[PDB]
Design a protein around this ligand. Sequence first.
Ligand SMILES: [Zn+2]
Ligand SMILES: [Zn+2]
Lengths: 102, 102
Amino acid sequence: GHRIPEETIEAIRRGVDIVDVIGEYVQLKRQGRNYFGLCPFHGEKTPSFSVSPEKQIFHCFGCGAGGNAFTFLMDIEGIPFVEAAKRLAAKAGVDLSVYELD
Amino acid sequence: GHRIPEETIEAIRRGVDIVDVIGEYVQLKRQGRNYFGLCPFHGEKTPSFSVSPEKQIFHCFGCGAGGNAFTFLMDIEGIPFVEAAKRLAAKAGVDLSVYELD
Ligand SMILES: [Zn+2]
Ligand SMILES: [Zn+2]
């Protein structure tokens, strides 16, 4: 479980687009149905980072990093799950004030 | 937060005690300033669930569930926030019929 109800965590995830989220940190270019760019987690000159709008997940073929929007924001900023859930909740339009976290 | 005014949500939270709310689902026993019992969210033989009267929150270290009375009710019964708020408002003495929810 978490300090945010399961159902609400679900609504947050469904309310955001991982491409929009990652695009605030990584310059992405469309290639087919996915978006690609340089991995911000590992160092290498060649693009190896991929994001899938359809699966709502990212993957890096150079370091193995990957996952959904929570995993990307907890690792890009070094912030805990409830802090990443707060920032995704604002993009999703989900209220989190009633759960007395912050 | 939704459809219930912020001041009304604070009257609900003041009007309920999470020890009393969780004690309707979990057998609790006081140990100094907290209440402890078996987790109803995850399966374990030993007690790992705690409730703080002062902070009005709960926590289970064997599964991570936790938070306030809203989180507890929504996750224990699998109900949305409006239903959880109507149940806690009935215990708090707060009338919500004038806000036109459901
Ligand atoms: Zn990488
Ligand atoms: Zn548990």
